Amino acid sequence: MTNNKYYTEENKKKVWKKHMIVLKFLEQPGISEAYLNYLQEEIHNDEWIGFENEFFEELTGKPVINV
Amino acid sequence: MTNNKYYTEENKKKVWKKHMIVLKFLEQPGISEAYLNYLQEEIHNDEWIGFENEFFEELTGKPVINVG
Ligand code: NI
Ligand code: NI
């Protein structure tokens, strides 16, 4: 069974760093409130499956990572 | 700038999912533009030293990840 195309070490590193970039953006004024309102809207979208812990941590201001 | 002590598989999976959540937020009206503005203000900030490639891929709309 071929090795992963998507969830790869290089790609996990790239997402880690790009997530740092976006995270500083989310803390900007105006943007913060909109991210929050978006998160409140999205937890009720059943398009996401298996994402419950992450939505909660995001909604409650929990640290991104543990540690 | 990090020793990668918390760069663990569990945390990588967590950051993966969260970044998917945020990615859908960026596609909303207004937010993509605001994000590009932010990145433009941000390019010459020595806050992102060592982030150059990621920053550039983000600014030029290059894919989030590399399929191959
Ligand atoms: Ni609901
Ligand atoms: Ni510069």
Numbering used by the authors:
A (entry chain C): 1 to 67
B (entry chain A): 1 to 68
Kindly provide excerpts from the paper associated with this entry.
Here we determined that the arbitrium system in Bacillus subtilis phage phi3T modulates the bacterial toxin–antitoxin system MazE–MazF to regulate the phage life cycle. AimX also inhibits the function of phi3T_93, a protein that promotes lysogeny by binding to MazE and releasing MazF. In all structures, phi3T_93 shows an identical all-helices fold composed of a longer N-terminal helix (α1), followed by two shorter helices (α2 and α3) connected by a long unstructured loop forming a V-like shape. The α1 helices of two phi3T_93 monomers interact, resulting in a W-shaped tight and globular dimer that displays two shallow grooves, one across each side of the dimer molecule.
We obtained the structure of phi3T_93 alone (wt and its N-terminal His-tagged version; His-phi3T_93) and in complex with AimX. Size exclusion chromatography coupled to multi-angle light scattering (SEC–MALS) analysis confirmed the phi3T_93 dimeric organization in solution. We hypothesize that phi3T_93 promotes lysogeny by binding AimX and MazE, reducing the amount of antitoxins that can block MazF activity.
